């Protein structure tokens, strides 16, 4: 989908334009790639061990009796 960013300072835009040209990219292609790269860097990994660890830590969620207490 489309995202409108308002009130970006002209000095920020001029620097981004110069950065993008050095990479052979338009301003908007550079911004799209920069945000995609950020998202890849932020992405979490969910492993089988993570899921086992959770099950062990909250095994009581599969206990109707404890879940009884939990809701008064």
């Amino acid at each position: 989908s489309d995202v409108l960013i308002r009130d970006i300072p002209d000095d920020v835009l001029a620097s981004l334009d110069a950065i993008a040209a050095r990479l052979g990219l338009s301003r908007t292609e550079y911004i799209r790639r920069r945000l995609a790269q950020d998202a890849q860097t932020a992405r979490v990994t969910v492993t089988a061990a993570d899921l086992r660890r959770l099950r062990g830590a909250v095994a009581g969620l599969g206990d109707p009796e404890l879940m009884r207490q939990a809701w008064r």
Partner: protein
């Protein structure tokens, strides 16, 4: 695809045992599996101590699940659905959390992911989409 899920406690604790574990792990990584504030309180209730609870909320998979909070429209819808179940003699089947998770999913555009037949009872009244986790 546009499909997103809201994971119930009954599926959360059984993911480690699903033959579809890998596909669900990938969807969680991508932000496609949301969780309610009420389910987080259920996770905390079950944890043996405060250290373990803090750890569970900051590590995957819970750290990767966006939180869906209640609104007045959702709380009122849960109560409406409860009263329809009670007309049929079935309202002590589904719990208050089951009602709140189902109404959150219904009004926020998510599929409930569960291992709890009470969601089938609710869906027979609301017509909403639900999915049962495969598990061994």
């Amino acid at each position: 695809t546009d499909q997103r899920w809201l994971i119930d406690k009954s599926a959360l604790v059984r993911l480690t045992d699903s033959p579809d574990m890998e596909i669900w792990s990938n969807r969680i990584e991508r932000g496609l599996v949301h969780i309610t504030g009420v389910t987080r309180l259920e996770v905390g209730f079950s944890a043996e101590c405060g250290e373990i609870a803090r750890r569970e909320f900051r590590e995957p998979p819970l750290s990767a699940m966006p939180v869906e909070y209640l609104t007045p429209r959702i709380e009122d819808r849960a109560l409406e659905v409860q009263t329809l179940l009670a007309d049929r003699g079935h309202h002590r089947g589904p719990s208050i959390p089951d009602l709140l998770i189902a109404a959150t999913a219904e009004l926020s555009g998510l599929t409930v992911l569960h291992v709890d037949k009470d969601f089938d009872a609710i869906a027979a009244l609301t017509g909403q989409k639900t999915e049962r986790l495969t598990h061994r």
